[PDB]
Amino acid sequence: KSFEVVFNDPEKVYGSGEKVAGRVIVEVCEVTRVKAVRILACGVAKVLWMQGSQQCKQTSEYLRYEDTLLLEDQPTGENEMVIMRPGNKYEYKFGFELPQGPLGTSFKGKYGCVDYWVKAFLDRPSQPTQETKKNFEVVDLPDLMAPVSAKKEKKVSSMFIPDGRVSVSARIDRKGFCEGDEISIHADFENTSSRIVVPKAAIVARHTYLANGQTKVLTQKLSSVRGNHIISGTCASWRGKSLRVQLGSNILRVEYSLLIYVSVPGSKKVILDLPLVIGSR
């Protein structure tokens, strides 16, 4: 009869970290026996694009949250069964938080979308499991194909070169690559410091996954390059130095950066970090 997912703030846009809460509300026109009231709540992004003849897709889960709802009058819990007569509203309470990190941010635009919703399954007498799904809105606090680029400068001083500096700037053509393509890096490096410095680049991947009872992050250096030593008092440039792109189903999403940095012996690295999207064939 009625079987409805009802949020406490029907109009809220939820932010990273907050907590999402409501009720599943069940009404009936004749007497029924209920095996379970369940919910699953998801958040997922699909980035999707053509690279010539071929489509490249990255999928990211931000929220995989499942659970069985208990009514106040079910004190013996959930391997126990309920009894639904007409005329009163049955309200199952539910809650969860949004994960910590960056969430996909509710979208339905050029290269795909991000949806969060809550699904409520019901289980009558001897029946298949009925459904209701309801969206909610989410918001994290640049076009996939535009060029991405950055520059950075650090003072690396010397008694005899007080104004010694190391700097780097780099540019790539788009932010989205398909596994297999190469990233062609354009970069200019200047070193007026007294050290010999070494420019390097690398794809680094952060895998977000569910170990227990947590969302952990595994980080992996996935592919890298090493330029020539740049000696004191000189500059050097990459003119399209190229860089190829190549646990379990507890694997939610992967985030990728191209790192283009310079190593200064006896001093901190200088790091540009350029985010990326990496889809499969």
Binding site: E190, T192, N228, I231, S232, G233, T234, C235, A236, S237
Partner: protein, 105 residues
């Protein structure tokens, strides 16, 4: 004075129109602090050593001269005679620059 090479052609003509004379080439870039720093000095030198020929090459304008010469960073200085390299070093270093000049005239 320093002569600005605009191409692989300009380069060749320079090299051969030179005589027995020493040619120095500052492979340069206009955004490079060190290359910018040493430019005036390269130039004062050119006025002083008027029996040596002084070229400049922009590695961004002529990457082809640049890679045919195997330039890897800037400033890099290369030294020629009768079409042929007799010297090379890199870095914005006035003193080293003047020494190689006097050492290879």
């Amino acid at each position: 004075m320093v002569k600005q090479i605009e191409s692989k052609t300009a380069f060749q003509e320079a090299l051969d129109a030179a005589g027995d004379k020493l040619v120095v080439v500052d492979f340069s870039a206009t955004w490079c602090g060190p290359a910018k720093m040493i430019k005036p000095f390269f130039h004062s030198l050119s006025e002083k050593y008027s029996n040596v020929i002084f070229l400049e090459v922009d590695v961004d304008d002529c990457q082809d001269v640049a890679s045919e010469c195997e330039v890897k960073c800037m400033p890099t200085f290369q030294f020629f005679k009768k079409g042929q390299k007799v010297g090379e070093f890199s870095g914005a270093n006035k003193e080293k620059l003047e020494a190689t000049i006097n050492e290879l005239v």
